[PDB]
Design a protein around this ligand. Structure first.
Ligand SMILES: O=S(=O)(Oc1ccc(Br)cc1)[C@@H]1C[C@@H]2O[C@H]1C(c1ccc(O)cc1)=C2c1ccc(O)cc1
Ligand SMILES: O=S(=O)(Oc1ccc(Br)cc1)[C@@H]1C[C@@H]2O[C@H]1C(c1ccc(O)cc1)=C2c1ccc(O)cc1
Lengths: 234, 10, 228, 9
């Protein structure tokens, strides 16, 4: 049913499959300790995972996969998908990362957790990169879907859907009035950022499943299982 | 078994 | 500059001539193999390959236009990626095996000699298999490799301009190959998505390399410490 | 750094 859909139908489906922007735990106290910082992030990410899972099942072609394949893809891409969400939300907040509408953080708070500020800078640069490119919402949901399907594909069906999203991405740029040259260039620019998102995920992951970051805050069972999938090995 | 299985089945 | 003045055919030509040679291993088909020996072989190979990569990078259009600090940064970030994409390129016509060197053709069975390398081996095999099904051309490979060098640590506007130039080059190649406009966009996307996998393999491979790890050389130790 | 000088040369 995914391959049969058109470009505008693809966009419409992805736009309406979008998860909500969840809030952090209220009562502020700007997270100055690494315990409170990790606490808020872990809690937030854990709640987002539930929405992400139901978001994935509403992505055209994902349901058509076996349950085993669905698990593998989500295991590989879950931090990537959280990150591209974060940088997308943080576009109109330069110099700051909008984890939640009630949780806006700068790089200074990134120093609260030992070794997290390196990745905050990368996230801020990615959000900044997206800003100057004037990344549209229709392109973002295309990029996020690509991350889900591509990051664990290494299967003719998946690549058939990946091509369909590519057709969709170009269709958006064509409508925006970009010339053919501006179309391949922008498409290339967007996909190269996915490599950086992968990089941030891997560097972030190896900290997250480290024994030090596992002991700072009691992690949920689900989040712990999503980490364990990457902890093979190090 | 994994929790991820259950949430995907639903 | 000059990289921005080059045509697509001149870009390809410049990249093809800048290609490093395929070095030989110090593998003796008697001998064991084992974790220590195999890691010794691959380290010695990569160490020697690094010297050629460094001089290859200088011949990449737009690279020497960058500062020395930025050149160092890009190579520190991308060196294992560049080694890996070179490896899977050599192994395209060798299904189920990895061609580290003409005298060193390994399968996943022997990749298990090193504890924790079999997973990365499988990913390398899958990537090479992916290149084989796509019928990756040499003109496309040298473009992808140059993209990896410039993009893996770009996080500046000059680099992006060279990236757009290499993008045009890839499209030019596919257009001469008879591919329709739709086929060009798709093939362009497929190739760049593989770079994400190559990034993944590098990261996973890197954290293994700077772990407990048998004697690494002086240059290779600095390339590793840049990620640690 | 070795990488620095090799690029220098
Ligand atoms: O990659 S990180 O910055 O994680 C860490 C990196 C280094 C250290 Br040290 C500790 C955590 C990661 C990105 C962002 O902040 C970290 C993090 C996070 C933290 C704890 C979790 O249980 C889950 C996710 C983030 C995050 C959370 C929710 C999002 O919607 C988006 C991003
Ligand atoms: O990503 S790996 O497989 O590295 C390891 C991963 C896990 C373990 Br355990 C040990 C090494 C990596 C890919 C390939 O085999 C490993 C490796 C290597 C080993 C030691 C070095 O000092 C440098 C490179 C490889 C390699 C070497 C030369 C190439 O031209 C291409 C790839």
């Amino acid at each position: 049913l995914a391959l049969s859909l058109t470009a505008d139908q693809m966009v419409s489906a992805l736009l309406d499959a979008e998860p909500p922007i969840l809030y952090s735990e209220y009562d502020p106290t700007r997270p100055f300790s690494e315990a409170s910082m990790m606490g808020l992030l872990t809690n937030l990410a854990d709640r987002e995972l539930v929405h992400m899972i139901n978001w994935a099942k509403r992505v055209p072609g994902f349901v058509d996969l076996t349950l085993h394949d669905q698990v593998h893809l989500l295991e590989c891409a879950w931090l990537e998908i959280l990150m591209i969400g974060l940088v997308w939300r943080s576009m109109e907040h330069p110099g700051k990362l909008l984890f939640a509408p009630n949780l806006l953080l700068d790089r200074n708070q990134g120093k609260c957790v030992e070794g997290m500020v390196e990745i905050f800078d990368m996230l801020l640069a990615t959000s900044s990169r997206f800003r100057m490119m004037n990344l549209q919402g229709e392109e973002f949901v295309c990029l996020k879907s690509i991350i889900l399907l591509n990051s664990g594909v290494y299967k003719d069906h998946i690549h058939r859907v990946l091509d369909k999203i590519t057709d969709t991405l170009i269709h958006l740029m064509a409508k925006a009035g970009l010339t053919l040259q501006q179309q391949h260039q922008r498409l290339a620019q967007l996909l190269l950022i996915l490599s950086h998102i992968r990089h941030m995920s891997n560097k972030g992951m190896e900290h997250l499943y480290s024994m030090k970051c596992k002991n700072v805050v009691p992690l949920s069972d689900l989040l712990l299982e999503m980490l364990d999938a990457h902890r093979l090995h190090a | 078994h994994k929790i991820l299985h259950r949430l995907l089945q639903d």
